[PDB]
């Protein structure tokens, strides 16, 4: 689907895409290859949809956190720079784009949020979040406000939420330990909600409203990344970039992202893209060209980062980074972000309490792991005749009773529907681990085209167990876990919002309670 003999690049609209296009034209002047740069809306959600069908751009730019999901889905080509090139980037930025032992992207720049403040209104920025209400009272009396920043994207509210103990996935990362609804997360999000309640902030403020308020001098402070500096420069505001305020004595902890460039697994121009990224973009002149459009942050290229680091705005960026944490790149990051976005917005607007909002977000971030735990154990004990002796772990009461419930209602379905199950199991003939990958197509077609309820979910998992028994008999026991993962992916992404609304697997257990 992708045209050969050229390069299409996607990058987000807040980045220096005009600068990126300039590097493209220099590539063109050398090779005769045209370089088109686009910045479509919601490109991080469009990429996986289009690239799954073999379409999309040759190169996609985004912070590294999304790339684990893309690599897991087979959407990114493995990148293979020689040691001479790898030595030119900071080791830690390469780590950010390593997934299951392979490099899946070229790292570009390190991004962290800072506090940006107007030196003509606040010559001394607050060191604590706690003192911002009184400062706002002080500024309101002068016709100004203390602080405005984007409240629609959780990226910007997360520093406050993690400050007192909130976190995504514990530590390696234990995908089973989610820290979205613990006391620390609550304490931070409560402080944000209280700021809104006391008229210090507006739940409706987004990126554009906050940017224009600061850049016109109506608000004294904003929270943003290095890409926003260019527009402040133009407004001629006298701004400083500094450490984020502490909360309850501890630092704000922003999720640090590494802007990175991935090559589409279906692109016919992988040698061209490697040549552009390694020998044109990731060079002193290439990054400067982008940086002059919208600042990149602390770039991954050592030769150039040595000059930018001297800029206090970059030193402040890297100080805020060292207090924060590099984002995971695991595939569940997207699900985490979707959940926390909904929770921050509902809590800020009043649709839910902080308790409600974060509980749902906790159930959403845990949905995939918990579903896989249940579905995999059921499939394997059904196929082998023996249960898994391993502890259930986090939320283990739910999983244990979900599985017990499933044993009850699932075994009755395999018996009563043995005729339909046998027939479906022949139309599909499963003999290979590869065939199991072909299932998702028909599996989704059937599961999607109807109503939603726990009974069809039981059918879904029960045929899964029916198919697992067969795989075991033909010595294909290795295919049962990839089968459990495919069932779980189909279930969680097609019924995410319904399942969260049912209180997840607690609803399951309650719905089929005797
Ligand atoms: C084809 C086909 N003909 N018939 C007759 C069936 C069974 O029919 C059933 C109808 C109802 C129920 N129950 C609901 C109420 N309760 S309960 O709540 O009261 N309780 C006590 C718990 C439990 C019992 C069970 C089975 C099938 C049939 C086969 C394989 C799988 C299903 C699925 C699950 C989705 C498909 O998954 C896979 C598809 C392909 C490979 C797969 C590998 C793994 C896993 C899943 C796979 C569905 C479904 O989406 O439902 N269906 C049926 C879809 N039909 C519906 C009727 O019209 C036409 C379509 C299936
Ligand atoms: O808010 C969730 C969002 O946060 C991060 O996205 C950042 C991005 O990293 C920055 O470069 C800049 O564009 O702002 C974005 C926030 O609006 C994550 O990278 C992204 O996956 C996540 O959804």
From Swiss-Prot:
Subunit (UniProt): The complex is composed of two ATP-binding proteins (MalK), two transmembrane proteins (MalG and MalF) and a solute-binding protein (MalE).
Cell compartments where the protein resides: Periplasm
Annotated family: Belongs to the bacterial solute-binding protein 1 family.
Gene responsible for this protein: malE
Protein name: Maltose/maltodextrin-binding periplasmic protein
GO annotation terms (biological process): maltodextrin transmembrane transport; maltose transport
Chloroplast is among the record's keywords: no
Species classification: Bacteria, Pseudomonadati, Pseudomonadota, Gammaproteobacteria, Enterobacterales
GO MF annotation: an example: carbohydrate transmembrane transporter activity
InterPro entries reported in the protein's UniProt record: Maltose/Cyclodextrin-bd, SBP, SBP_1_CS
Organism domain of life: Bacteria
Function of the protein: Part of the ABC transporter complex MalEFGK involved in maltose/maltodextrin import. Binds maltose and higher maltodextrins.
Disulphide linkage map: none
Entries under SUPFAM superfamilies matching the protein: Periplasmic binding protein-like II
GO cellular component: ATP-binding cassette (ABC) transporter complex, substrate-binding subunit-containing; outer membrane-bounded periplasmic space
Keywords attached to this entry: Periplasm, Signal, Sugar transport, Transport
């Amino acid at each position: 689907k992708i045209e050969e003999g050229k390069l299409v690049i996607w990058i987000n609209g807040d980045k220096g895409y005009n600068g990126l296009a300039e590097v493209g034209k220099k590539f063109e002047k050398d090779t005769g290859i045209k370089v088109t740069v686009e910045h479509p809306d919601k490109l991080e959600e469009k990429f996986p949809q289009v690239a799954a069908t073999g379409d999309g751009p040759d190169i996609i730019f985004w912070a590294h956190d999304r790339f684990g999901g893309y690599a897991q889905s087979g959407l990114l080509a493995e990148i293979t720079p020689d040691k001479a090139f790898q030595d030119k980037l900071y080791p830690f930025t390469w780590d950010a784009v390593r997934y299951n032992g392979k490099l899946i992207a070229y790292p570009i720049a390190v991004e962290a949020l800072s506090l940006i403040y107007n030196k003509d209104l606040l010559p001394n920025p607050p060191k604590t979040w706690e003192e911002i209400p009184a400062l706002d009272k002080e500024l309101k009396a002068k016709g100004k406000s203390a602080l405005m920043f984007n409240l629609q994207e959780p990226y910007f509210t997360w520093p406050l939420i993690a400050a007192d103990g909130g976190y995504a996935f514990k530590y390696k990362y234990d995908i089973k330990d989610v820290g979205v609804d613990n006391a620390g997360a609550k304490a931070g999000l409560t402080f944000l909600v209280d700021l809104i309640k006391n008229k210090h902030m507006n739940a409706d403020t987004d990126y554009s409203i906050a940017e224009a308020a600061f850049n016109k001098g109506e608000t004294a402070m904003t929270i943003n990344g290095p890409w926003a500096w260019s527009n402040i420069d133009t407004s001629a505001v006298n701004y400083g970039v500094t450490v984020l305020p502490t909360f309850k004595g501890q630092p704000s902890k922003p999720f640090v992202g590494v802007l990175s460039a991935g090559i589409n697994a279906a692109s016919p121009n992988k040698e061209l893209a490697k040549e552009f990224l390694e020998n044109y973009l990731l060079t002193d002149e290439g990054l400067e060209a982008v940086n002059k459009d919208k600042p990149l942050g602390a770039v991954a290229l050592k030769s150039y980062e040595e000059e930018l680091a001297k800029d206090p705005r970059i030193a402040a960026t890297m100080e805020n980074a060292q207090k924060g944490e590099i984002m995971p790149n695991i595939p569940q990051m997207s699900a985490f972000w979707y959940a926390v976005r909904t929770a921050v917005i509902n809590a800020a607007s009043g649709r839910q309490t902080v308790d409600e909002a974060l509980k749902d977000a906790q159930t959403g971030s845990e949905l995939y792991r918990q579903s896989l735990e249940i579905i995999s154990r059921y499939l394997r004990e059904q196929a082998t005749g023996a249960a898994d002796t391993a502890p259930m772990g986090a939320s283990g009461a739910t999983s244990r009773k979900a599985l017990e419930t499933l044993r009850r209602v699932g075994d009755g379905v395999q018996r009563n529907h043995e005729t339909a199950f046998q027939g479906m199991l022949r139309k599909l003939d499963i003999k290979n681990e590869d065939d199991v990958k072909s299932l998702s197509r028909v599996m989704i077609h059937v599961f999607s085209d109807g109503v939603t309820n726990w009974g069809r979910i039981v059918t879904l998992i029960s045929f899964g167990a029916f198919v697992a028994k067969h795989l075991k008999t033909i010595n294909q026991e290795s295919c049962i876990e990839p089968l459990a993962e495919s069932i779980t992916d189909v279930l969680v992404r097609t019924k995410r919002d319904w399942l969260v609304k049912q209180r997840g697997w607690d609803g399951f257990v309650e719905f089929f309670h005797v």
